[PDB]
Amino acid sequence: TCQPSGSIQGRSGNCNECCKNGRRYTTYGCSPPVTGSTRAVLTLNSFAEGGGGAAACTGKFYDDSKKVVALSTGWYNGGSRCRKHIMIHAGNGNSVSALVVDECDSTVGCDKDHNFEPPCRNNIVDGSPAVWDALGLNKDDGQAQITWSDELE
Amino acid sequence: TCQPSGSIQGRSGNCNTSECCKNGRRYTTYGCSPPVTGSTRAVLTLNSFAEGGDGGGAAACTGKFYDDSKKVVALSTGWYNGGSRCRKHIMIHAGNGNSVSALVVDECDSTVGCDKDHNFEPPCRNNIVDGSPAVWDALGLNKDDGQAQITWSDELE
Amino acid sequence: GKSEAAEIEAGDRLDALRDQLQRYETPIIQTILARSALGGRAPSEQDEVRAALSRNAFEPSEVISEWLQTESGARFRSTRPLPPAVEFITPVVLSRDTVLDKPVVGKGIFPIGRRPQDPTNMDEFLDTSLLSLNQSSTVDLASAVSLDVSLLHLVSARVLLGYPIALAKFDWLHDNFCHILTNTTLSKSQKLANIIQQLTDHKQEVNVLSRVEQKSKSLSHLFRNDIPYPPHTQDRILRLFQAYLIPITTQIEAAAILDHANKC
Amino acid sequence: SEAAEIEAGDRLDALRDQLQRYETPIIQTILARSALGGRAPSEQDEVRAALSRNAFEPSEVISEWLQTESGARFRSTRPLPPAVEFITPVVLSRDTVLDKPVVGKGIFPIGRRPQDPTNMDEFLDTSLLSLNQSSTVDLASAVSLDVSLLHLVSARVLLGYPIALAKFDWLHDNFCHILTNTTLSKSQKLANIIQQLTDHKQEVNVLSRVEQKSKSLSHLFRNDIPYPPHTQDRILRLFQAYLIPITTQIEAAAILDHANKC
């Protein structure tokens, strides 16, 4: 079963969520098992250009109207879901198809490369605003419990 | 009085058929223009100062290009006078009684021509006001003229 | 604790070194474009580049120089007069038909390393680029050779930053690397593979290569009456980073960590 | 006589293309060095030593011209390449506006103000000295880019020599009228020839393009360190105050000794 890969000493550097100095942050190379109804935490992210890196699958940026996601490293699975779709289900009964474009990197964090932010958790679907709106979820919540599965085409 | 400075052997290069220089004839160069009298007789020609057009290089007074709606002109080297009229206006009078104020932005270079730098076109003549399309339209002249008899004067302040 | 403080310096040190690594991107790209814009290949240019490197030999720093003597480091020592790492050959890792520069469904983009048909090392890659130009009787030998020599020093210095980066990464992620280094199940060869894998972050690689492609396109803009760049100029700029600079840097980093296994 | 003028015009067109071809390499090389980092300890000395150890000699045509009386004015002290020590006379005022359109004058006036460095060697040395000292910049890379730039600017202005020979055949009568004038002193002939060679509208065309290139090629991308202040200004100044006027003087010097061909 999926175990941590290690941990990193927090540094807040110049980040204004930021890593905090007195702690350690865990890293992961794996994610939970992928089932036909995979339980995950949906977070909120913008994939647009300006003022974060290019999307891992394509080297591109995506404006907030695009329904795109990043997956925790384990689910990202070396790129095997790149430019494939996943079906996301929210607890309120809404669902949306989203394009996998990026990795939510759980292997590294708390450095200038990641704006001194912590490493992604290992069960994350990091969704654009349009994913949240399609799910009828309140973007002020910051995170939501979801399920997802690989979609056919 | 104003005399030619010399002449240049025509070469057509890759120019199409604005007139190209023709092989087998020479083209006169001038450093001077006729006297500026305050109602100076000139030939108005037609030119585009726009960037895309490939008619020309950047404007001598400013290093810029000008779209055809701007009322701007180039002056023969002598009247251009080392830049003394740069970003000043001249009042142009056409034979039909219309007049227009135009901004001087460029030199119609009479010292050189028939080379790749000028797309194998001849050196400007020495008595030219080379006007944008908006200059001709403001004067009510038919651009199919190609050239018109005018008079011009500096707009002093 | 004493440990925690040492890790924190280490991250601070790594951040600064990473900035230094990225700072080579634009100079390498500008130097390639300058030589490509300048003209064709001069008679005996390759020979003149070696003579220039021989006559104007810059020696590496003392720490690197010694490292180059040690066996691990000696695989990055070049035949004189070439600078360090420009002869190092990474093993072929891609297939002949690997798609290099567009998104591939189910894989991603910008796969790193050499295909069988790629030149073995950076010296040969740049030599091959030079040979693809026609011999020119008008190109200035001094300018051309000087830009060639500039590029060789730039690419060498860029990848050699892997060594101090590796030392900073080792202190920053001490437990991660020692868990590999002290594993008595692994051969020396398997430890190298696992270290390289721990050092590899392809999402960061895509970030770099996306920007390199963008820079190469933007900086190769033609202005009025300019002579065009030779075909594939932008492709070869990307290939330099994707097939050589990134994987060689990583390998230098892994080599360095392995040299400091006694610190576990 | 027609045919020779035609040939010369053709030849001039090709040489002008070769001259313009230096624009982008010079600008990219300045930007590469500026993006790279600060100044290394003893960088200037290392530049001189590199020039000595990798001494490129000019072509036999250039090396022999540099032995003639007019050409000798462009021979530099070893190990510097030709023309990089040549000093043009001050022609601008301290407050002359350099890079904006001036009512009643124009734009991009050529040449040196009293405060400009005397020659290209000093100009590039002043640029290098304006950088901060750095302990992280790679000495080999920095010196190699410095040397590239010195070789580029020398080769660029030396194209004035073959350009002048072609212009002489193309505009034979114009120059011969000056050269065979027995009332003019040597220096008045030099002045009149320089004026015949000067076309400011073409100069504005080049400098406008250099300004565009310097802006476009200095574009900043994701997480890039900015260029030092005034990097673009000094690129323009290199062309406007040195490369263009020195090229014109090289052309004038080449013409001046050609009265026997009239």
Tokens coding D5: 């003028």
| Closest CA in chain A for residue C108 | A57
For an interface test with D, the pick among B22, B29, B62 (most D C-beta atoms closer than 10 Å) comes out as B62
D207 in contact with B, Cβ within 8 Å: yes
Give pairs for B140-148: CB < 8 Å, separation 24+.
Answer: B140/B94, B140/B96, B140/B98, B141/B44, B141/B94, B141/B96, B141/B98, B143/B46, B145/B46, B146/B45, B146/B46, B147/B43, B147/B44, B147/B45, B147/B46, B148/B43, B148/B44, B148/B94, B148/B95
CA distance C221 to chain D (A): 8
Q: How far B150 CA sits from the closest chain D CA (Å)?
A: 23
Positive/negative CA dihedral, D15, D18, D23, D29? negative
Asked if the C-beta of C9 comes within 8 angstroms of chain A's C-beta atoms, the answer is: no
- Which residues from chain B sit within 8 angstroms of residue D201, using beta carbons? 57, 60, 106-107, 109
The residue in chain C having the minimum alpha-carbon distance to the alpha carbon of residue D217 is: C219
Q: Are D129 and D39 in contact (CB under 8 A)?
A: yes
Query: Any chain A CB within 8 A of the CB of C174?
Result: no
**Quick one: resolution in A?**
1.8
Of the candidates A54, A82, A108, the beta carbon closest to that of C201 is on A108
CA gap D98, D109 in Å, rounded = 6
**CA gap B90, B129 in Å, rounded:** 10
* Pair type for strands B72-76 and B26-29: unpaired
> Which of D7, D1, D21 lies closest to D167, judged by CA?
D7
Using what technique was this structure determined?
A: X-ray
Contact C56 D54 (CB under 8 A): yes
Total domain count for chain B?
A: 1
Within 13 A of D58's CA, how many CA atoms are on the CB side?
A: 27
Residues C34, D28: C-beta atoms closer than 8 Å: yes
Report yes or no on chains A and C touching (3+ CB pairs under 8 A): yes
CB neighbours (10 Å) of residue A51?
A: 4
Which phi and psi (to 5°) does residue B109 adopt?
-80, 110
CB–CB contact D16 B60 (8 Å) = no
Domain boundaries, chain C: 1-264
Return the bridge partners of A87, or none.
Answer: A97, A149
Q: What gap in Å lies between CA A82 and CA C157, rounded to an integer? A: 34
Q: Which of C98, C203, C212, C217 to mutate to test the interface with A (most CBs of A within 10 A)?
A: C203
Helix (H, G, I), strand (E, B) or coil at B36: coil
Q: What is the C-alpha R_g of chain D?
A: 19
Residues of chain D contacting residue C207, judged by C-beta atoms under 8 Å apart: 222
| Nearest residue of D to residue C213, measured between CA atoms | D221
Residues of B in contact with D2 (CB under 8 A): 9, 24
Which residues partner with B45 through β-bridges?
A: B130, B147
CA distance C168 to chain D (A): 16
**Alpha-carbon gap, residue D13 to C39, rounded angstroms:** 17
Q: Give chain C positions within 8 Å (CB) of D49.
A: 56
Q: In the structure encoding, which two tokens stand for residue B152, read together?
A: 């011009």
Q: Which residues pair with C176 in a beta bridge?
A: none
Q: How far is CA C200 from CA A36, C175, C204, D2, in A?
A: 30, 17, 9, 69
Instruction: Kindly tell me the burial class for residue A58, based on how many C-beta atoms sit within 10 Å of its own C-beta (0-12, 13-18, 19 or more).
Output: buried
Q: How is residue C102 written in tokens?
A: 């567009």
State the Cα–Cα distance between residues D253 and D248, nearest whole angstrom: 9
- Partners of D174 on chain B (C-beta within 8 Å) are 5-6, 29
With b for 16 or more beta-carbon neighbours within 10 A and e for fewer, the B58-76 pattern comes to bbbbbbbbbebebbbbbbb
Across the strands, what pairs with B75?
Answer: B107, B129
Q: Using CB atoms within 10 A of its CB, is residue C165 exposed (0-12), middle (13-18) or buried (19+)?
A: buried
- For B89, the enclosing helix (H) or strand (E) is strand B89-94
Distance of alpha carbon C215 from alpha carbon D174, whole angstroms:
48
C-alpha distances in Å from residue A57, one per residue of A71, A149, C103, C107: 11, 19, 6, 7
C-chain CB neighbours of D219 within 8 Å are 218-219
Give the nearest partner residue to D174 out of B6, B62, B106, using CB atoms: B6
Bridge partners (DSSP) of residue A27 are: A6
The helix (run of H) or strand (run of E) holding residue B154 is: strand B147-154
Contacts of C193 (CB under 8 A, 6+ apart): none
C-beta atoms of C30 and D25 within 8 A = no
CA-based nearest residue to A94, from A54, A146, A49, A57 = A146
Question: A11 vs C8: CB contact, 8 Å cut-off?
Answer: yes
DSSP 8-class letter at C41 = B
**Interruption sites in chain A after residues (C→N beyond 2.5 Å):** 16, 51
In b/e form, how buried is each residue of C151-162, taking b as 16+ CB within 10 angstroms?
Answer: bbbbbbbbbbbb
Dihedral sign, CA of A29, A33, A36, A37? Answer: negative
Residue B40: phi and psi, rounded to 5, are -80, 125
Q: How many CB atoms lie within 10 A of CB C144?
A: 28
Beta carbon pairs, B and D, within 8 Å: 86
Rounded (10°) angle between helices C141-160 and C25-38: 160
User: For residue D41, is the peptide bond before it cis, meaning its omega torsion is within 30 degrees of 0?
Assistant: no
Asked if D97 is an interface residue toward chain B (Cβ–Cβ < 8 A), one would say no
Helix (H, G, I), strand (E, B) or coil at B43: strand
Instruction: For residue A103, give its domain range.
Output: 1-153
Contact between chain A and chain B (3 or more Cβ pairs less than 8 Å apart): no
Sign of CA dihedral D121, D125, D128, D133: positive
Parallel, antiparallel or unpaired: strands B147-154 and B89-94: antiparallel
Beta bridge partners of A89: A95, A147
Q: Percent helix, strand and coil across chain C, each rounded to 5?
A: 65, 0, 35
Q: What is the CA radius of gyration of chain B?
A: 15
Q: Which residues touch D207 (CB under 8 Å, ≥6 apart)?
A: B63, D108, D236, D239, D240, D244
Residue indicated by tokens 């006297």:
B35
Which amino acid, C172?
W
> If we measure between CA atoms, which residue out of B42, B55, B67 comes closest to residue B139?
B42
